[PDB]
C-alpha cells in the first residue's frame, strides 16, 4: 500500500474490507502478513521480540520512532497502523468468531456436511444399483439362453 505518505480513513477502510479475504488470520499470526512488512522490518521486530500482530499493535509511538529512525524500518508506521486498524476484529474472531459464525451457523454447517455425505453415498449407490441390475439382466439372459437351447 502506498498511503501517499500517511495512513488515512480510506486506507483503514481498505484494510477493514480486505479483512474478509483472510478468514484464517488470527490476532496471533506471524508479523509477515502485515502490509509493507519487509524482511528488514520483520527481523528488527523479531529482535524486539515481536512475533504477533497483537504485539505490533501494542507498540508505543516512541518504540515506532526508534524502529523507524534508528533501526531503518521505513514503513514501520504503515505496519503499525495496519496492526492497530485490524487488531480489534481479530480479537473478536479469536474469542468467538462473530463475523464468521453469525452468518452461517452450526445448524447450516451440519446441514451442509450431512447433505454432502448423503450425496456422496448416493453417487456410489447409483453405480451399485446399476451394477446389480446389470448382473440380474445377465442372469436373465443366461436363463433365456438355457430355455432356447432346451427348445
Amino acid at each position: 500500500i502506498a498511503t501517499g505518505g500517511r495512513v488515512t480513513n480510506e486506507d483503514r477502510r481498505w484494510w477493514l474490507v480486505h479483512l474478509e479475504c483472510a478468514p484464517d488470520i488470527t490476532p496471533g499470526t506471524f508479523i509477515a502478513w502485515l502490509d509493507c512488512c519487509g524482511t528488514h522490518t520483520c527481523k528488527k521486530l523479531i529482535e524486539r521480540n515481536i512475533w504477533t500482530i497483537e504485539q505490533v499493535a501494542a507498540l508505543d509511538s516512541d518504540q515506532v520512532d526508534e524502529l523507524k529512525y534508528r533501526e531503518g524500518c521505513l514503513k514501520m508506521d504503515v505496519v503499525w497502523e495496519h496492526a492497530r486498524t485490524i487488531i480489534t476484529p481479530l480479537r473478536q474472531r479469536e474469542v468467538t468468531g462473530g463475523v464468521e459464525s453469525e452468518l452461517q451457523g452450526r445448524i447450516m454447517e451440519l446441514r451442509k456436511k450431512r447433505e454432502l455425505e448423503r450425496r456422496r453415498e448416493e453417487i456410489l449407490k447409483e453405480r451399485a444399483n446399476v451394477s446389480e441390475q446389470r448382473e440380474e439382466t445377465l442372469r436373465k439372459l443366461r436363463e433365456a439362453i438355457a430355455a432356447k437351447k432346451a427348445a
Binding site: T39, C42, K43, K44, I46, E47, N49
Partner: protein, 61 residues
C-alpha cells in the same frame, strides 16, 4: 631419452604443483583461523547488520 625426459619433467611438475596447492590450502585455513579468532575477540560477526535474535529465529538461514 626423449620419452623418459618428457615423462620425468611432467611428473616433477605435477609433484611441485601438488605441494604448492597443499601449502596454499594450509595457509588459507590458517588465515581463516586467525580471522575467526580476531572476529571473536573484537565482537565482529558476519551475520548481517542484525543481532543474534534473527539467527535464533532462523527463519531465513
Amino acid at each position: 631419452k626423449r620419452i623418459d625426459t618428457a615423462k620425468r619433467m611432467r611428473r616433477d611438475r605435477r609433484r611441485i604443483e601438488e605441494l604448492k596447492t597443499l601449502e596454499f590450502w594450509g595457509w588459507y585455513m590458517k588465515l581463516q583461523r586467525v580471522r575467526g579468532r580476531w572476529c571473536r575477540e573484537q565482537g565482529v560477526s558476519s551475520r548481517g547488520v542484525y543481532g543474534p535474535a534473527v539467527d535464533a529465529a532462523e527463519l531465513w538461514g
